[PDB]
Amino acid sequence: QYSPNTQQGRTSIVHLFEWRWVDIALECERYLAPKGFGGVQVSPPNENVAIYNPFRPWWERYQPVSYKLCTRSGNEDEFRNMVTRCNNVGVRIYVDAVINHMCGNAVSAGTSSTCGSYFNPGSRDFPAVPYSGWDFNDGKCKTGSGDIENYNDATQVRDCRLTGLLDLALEKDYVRSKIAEYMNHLIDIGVAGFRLDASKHMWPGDIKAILDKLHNLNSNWFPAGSKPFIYQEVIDLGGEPIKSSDYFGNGRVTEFKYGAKLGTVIRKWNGEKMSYLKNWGEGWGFVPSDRALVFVDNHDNQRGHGAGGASILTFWDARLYKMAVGFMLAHPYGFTRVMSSYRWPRQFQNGNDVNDWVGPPNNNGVIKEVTINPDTTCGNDWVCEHRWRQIRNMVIFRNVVDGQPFTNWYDNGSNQVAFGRGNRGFIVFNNDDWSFSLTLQTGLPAGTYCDVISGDKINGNCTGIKIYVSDDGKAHFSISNSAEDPFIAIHAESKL
């Protein structure tokens, strides 16, 4: 459950948040395969509540109505077509599995669902599964409200309703079996693994019992005996009894401390600075690298009041964001996920975004296609961070340097830092308010290297900055604090 099942030499996944299946299939073929991406995290592919007040928010997809593969992203045939096409070009699909709960307990009964299935939250009836009142934790939860009230009580966090979401009785074999039926449908279609949503709200042993029912990956594409990659969304910032280490026997865990601390460092909050990153990793209190799924932002916390609050860097902070993503992609800790977002009309009032609910770009609720512009950016309000040169080229950097040790660290005691990855790559950052002009030991063979942040190696030439490495491994780097991107990265495949 710990290995991503990507092709060898592909080292990241991208979250194509709220993309339609047909667009992901095209993206696999036209971009993700040639540019070296390992795979895609898809939005929940199972039927959810259609919420009209407010209008079709992104978070309606975290309120299941059934396990039918029928959503605003597409139907089952479209989902299978995407998985097949992506696997055929060596790009994997990871499903966001929403298995702790069904929908909010106060949602009105009827057929306001993405496939038109009937459901009745008040009577606990989800006949398209089917689930009934016997399948929820109403009787087990001990709180006065029936909801989670106190995170210092690890029992209620698991047995009670997360903000009113009907909480499935995951101890029951019937419920475990319905969830496994859904997940095995997906595995047998060709999915490579799963994000387990809301894992802090599930007992480690109930997750384990579900995972014990799962198939090995589809043997038309994967070697015999391949296990699905499992990454559990456990929000653990310290200071609560539940620790993400309780989940290590099941799979990897999301390390939310990663982006929270990287954001505070790059924003220079509370006296933090990039020179402190020399011991980045477990020395900062993080989970072991081989259990970490890391990221700068995710779909919830890029809206500013998730895990990390206001420290989280996002595409709205483009210059600092590219630097944070670049640091992450260069550094060996963890398995990396890149976010790919849509734009929305962010409107802060008293420090909070009143439009944080807005769903993906749409015409009357129908998600818009992803259009590709001639400069390789996207239209229709899709941000496509994964197509930004500075991010895509760092996804490639991470592939090129895979397995190489962290070495040749330099810092100026402030915010000018650099490090290498064995003899295969080197990266230099200037986050101080002055210039960074210095000769550094790079660990690389002598030659001329293209900076892949300011440009590309194309037709045996560099389109941006060129770096000259001497016989001693040293090279001169100059980065003004006014540069478009105040970091430079070079690697073995950017050498002329």
Ligand SMILES: O=C(/C=C/c1ccc(O)c(O)c1)N[C@@H](Cc1ccc(O)cc1)C(=O)NCCCOc1c(-c2ccc(O)c(O)c2)oc2cc(O)cc(O)c2c1=O
């Ligand atoms: O803001 C949201 C949704 C956020 C959200 C959705 C999926 C996630 O994986 C996630 O991490 C956050 N939802 C809105 C509106 C809402 C939706 C449903 C509901 O029952 C109540 C309200 C909201 O304001 N939610 C309250 C704050 C966010 O509280 C939620 C968390 C959450 C946040 C921080 C934590 O430390 C934690 O343990 C859980 O996880 C969810 C998981 C879900 O599967 C579905 C949810 O509705 C939620 C969810 O509401």
Ligand SMILES: *[C@@H]1O[C@H](CO)[C@@H](O)[C@H](O)[C@H]1NC(C)=O
């Ligand atoms: C590189 O650029 C130079 C100058 O534009 C050009 O003469 C040369 O043909 C290009 N390609 C190679 C492989 O040198």
Ligand SMILES: [Ca+2]
């Ligand atoms: Ca639960």
Ligand SMILES: [Cl-]
């Ligand atoms: Cl996540």
